[PDB]
Design an enzyme around this catalytic site. Structure first.
Site, PDB file in Angstrom:
ATOM      1  N   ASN A  29      -5.743 -11.417  14.081  1.00 46.59           N
ATOM      2  CA  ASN A  29      -4.791 -12.375  13.523  1.00 46.59           C
ATOM      3  C   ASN A  29      -4.632 -13.369  14.669  1.00 46.59           C
ATOM      4  OD1 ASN A  29      -2.346 -13.817  12.850  1.00 46.59           O
ATOM      5  ND2 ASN A  29      -1.794 -12.133  11.469  1.00 46.59           N
ATOM      6  N   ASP A  31      -3.219 -16.506  14.643  1.00 46.07           N
ATOM      7  CA  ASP A  31      -2.025 -17.353  14.682  1.00 46.07           C
ATOM      8  C   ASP A  31      -2.458 -18.789  15.000  1.00 46.07           C
ATOM      9  OD1 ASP A  31       0.828 -18.074  14.872  1.00 46.07           O
ATOM     10  OD2 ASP A  31       0.555 -18.041  17.052  1.00 46.07           O
ATOM     11  N   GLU A  57      -4.679 -15.708   9.367  1.00 48.15           N
ATOM     12  CA  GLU A  57      -3.799 -16.809   9.766  1.00 48.15           C
ATOM     13  C   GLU A  57      -4.514 -17.897  10.559  1.00 48.15           C
ATOM     14  OE1 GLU A  57       0.649 -16.876  10.771  1.00 48.15           O
ATOM     15  OE2 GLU A  57       0.072 -14.754  10.915  1.00 48.15           O
ATOM     16  N   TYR A 132      -4.813 -10.733   4.811  1.00 48.78           N
ATOM     17  CA  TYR A 132      -3.611 -11.164   5.470  1.00 48.78           C
ATOM     18  C   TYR A 132      -2.528 -10.959   4.416  1.00 48.78           C
ATOM     19  CZ  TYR A 132       0.061 -13.803   7.567  1.00 48.78           C
ATOM     20  OH  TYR A 132       1.316 -14.119   8.006  1.00 48.78           O
ATOM     21  N   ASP A 171      -4.499  -7.882   9.097  1.00 46.08           N
ATOM     22  CA  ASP A 171      -3.059  -7.676   9.181  1.00 46.08           C
ATOM     23  C   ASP A 171      -2.512  -7.209   7.831  1.00 46.08           C
ATOM     24  OD1 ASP A 171      -0.258  -9.780  10.293  1.00 46.08           O
ATOM     25  OD2 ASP A 171      -0.372  -7.683   9.676  1.00 46.08           O
ATOM     26  N   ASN A 173       0.352  -5.985   7.460  1.00 45.90           N
ATOM     27  CA  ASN A 173       1.779  -6.235   7.564  1.00 45.90           C
ATOM     28  C   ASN A 173       2.774  -5.094   7.414  1.00 45.90           C
ATOM     29  OD1 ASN A 173       3.672  -8.372   8.173  1.00 45.90           O
ATOM     30  ND2 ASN A 173       2.135  -9.718   7.243  1.00 45.90           N
ATOM     31  N   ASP A 244      -1.994  -4.174  12.342  1.00 50.43           N
ATOM     32  CA  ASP A 244      -3.407  -4.412  12.058  1.00 50.43           C
ATOM     33  C   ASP A 244      -4.168  -3.098  11.980  1.00 50.43           C
ATOM     34  OD1 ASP A 244      -2.104  -6.616  13.870  1.00 50.43           O
ATOM     35  OD2 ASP A 244      -3.673  -7.642  12.728  1.00 50.43           O
ATOM     36  N   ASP A 269       0.144 -13.640  19.025  1.00 51.43           N
ATOM     37  CA  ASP A 269       1.140 -12.560  19.139  1.00 51.43           C
ATOM     38  C   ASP A 269       0.554 -11.227  18.671  1.00 51.43           C
ATOM     39  OD1 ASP A 269       3.237 -14.239  16.607  1.00 51.43           O
ATOM     40  OD2 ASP A 269       1.098 -13.734  16.608  1.00 51.43           O
ATOM     41  N   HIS A 270      -0.673 -11.309  18.165  1.00 49.60           N
ATOM     42  CA  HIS A 270      -1.439 -10.165  17.708  1.00 49.60           C
ATOM     43  C   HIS A 270      -2.633 -10.062  18.632  1.00 49.60           C
ATOM     44  CE1 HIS A 270       0.219  -9.219  13.651  1.00 49.60           C
ATOM     45  NE2 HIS A 270       0.759 -10.411  13.838  1.00 49.60           N
TER      46      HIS A 270
END
EC number: 3.1.11.2
Length: 279
Positions: A29, A31, A57, A132, A171, A173, A244, A269-270
């Site tokens: 991911n 971002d 993302e 995602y 991800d 989530n 993830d 951030d992942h």
DNA sequence: GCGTCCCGACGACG
DNA sequence: GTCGTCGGGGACGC
């Protein structure tokens, strides 16, 4: 926290029967694909040299994809998906070394196919699906929709798995159990660890069915996360979540060599996760 | 720069 | 120890 740091064990590239690994899938991911590339993300990907790369993302239009994506000699078969309207939101992509037999977008449901969340790449021995999964958001504003998504997704994945071995990465989530995140108590009413989401994950594993590659290999290994909020130096302290995954059909377990979490890789951030399979 | 979408730190408590 | 409350990182389209 901080001291309860995590050191992911060396890569194990051998199946239970001794067969050497032949496939290396990496999910991440990013971002923001554009931002990630600027932060040396691709440089890290060249070092990993995966056979397939799945990104979540991306937040990028195909018209605006960086030219650096055409300097990946080992991942020349590039597939992308972005939302039908929300420009710069969500976004998913899959880069493969070999040409996939077939490639599809979405889960065949008009309602859950508008935010660029799923890509399906069918190969000879298996079916790859990167995703995602919808965020329930702050105030759980989207928890009702998330449950509808969860149902459509597992029903769709069950269908794929019925015709060929399945591998779902990306991800998802949700931090399944309490071991999947640093703070289980204080995040019980937060998006990502609500009971409805955890149950939705459990039903997914049993329905298809699917096995959590990492947890399968490391049942009691704690402090292993993939996400850390950019706030309060959380990463430096390792106060994160395991959002993830790499979920595989049970019939791919004898082919599982390892499931890694690349904690040192920066750019989002992942952090990236990697799968090894002796196929 | 703004509007928006992707939670750990702490007094307060008894 | 748990319960609110608060202060609060980054990427992107406009």
């Amino acid at each position: 926290e901080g001291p309860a740091l995590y050191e992911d064990p060396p890569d194990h590239k051998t199946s239970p029967s001794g067969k050497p690994a032949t496939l290396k899938i990496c999910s991440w991911n990013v971002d923001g694909l554009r931002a990630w590339i600027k932060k040396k993300g691709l440089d890290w990907v060249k070092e990993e040299a995966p056979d397939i790369l799945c990104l979540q993302e991306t937040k990028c239009s195909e018209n605006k994809l960086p030219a650096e994506l055409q300097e990946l000699p080992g991942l020349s078969h590039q597939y992308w998906s972005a939302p039908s309207d929300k420009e710069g939101y969500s976004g998913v992509g899959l880069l493969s070394r070999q040409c996939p037999l077939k490639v599809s977008y979405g889960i065949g449901d008009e309602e859950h196919d508008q935010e660029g969340r799923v890509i399906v790449a069918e190969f000879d021995s298996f079916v790859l699906v990167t995703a995602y999964v919808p965020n329930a958001g702050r105030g759980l504003v989207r928890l009702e929709y998330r449950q509808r998504w969860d149902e459509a997704f597992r029903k769709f994945l069950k269908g794929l798995a019925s015709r060929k071995p399945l591998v779902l990465c990306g991800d998802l989530n949700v931090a399944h159990e309490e071991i999947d995140l640093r703070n289980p108590k204080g995040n019980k009413k937060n998006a990502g660890f609500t009971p409805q989401e955890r149950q939705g994950f459990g039903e997914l594993l049993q329905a298809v069915p699917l096995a959590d590659s990492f947890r399968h290999l490391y049942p009691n290994t704690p402090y292993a996360y993939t996400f850390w909020t950019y706030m309060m130096n959380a990463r430096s302290k390792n106060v994160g979540w395991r959002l993830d995954y790499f979920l595989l059909s049970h019939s791919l377990l004898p082919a599982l060599c390892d499931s890694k979490i690349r904690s040192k890789a920066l750019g989002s951030d992942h952090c990236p996760i990697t799968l090894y399979l002796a196929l």
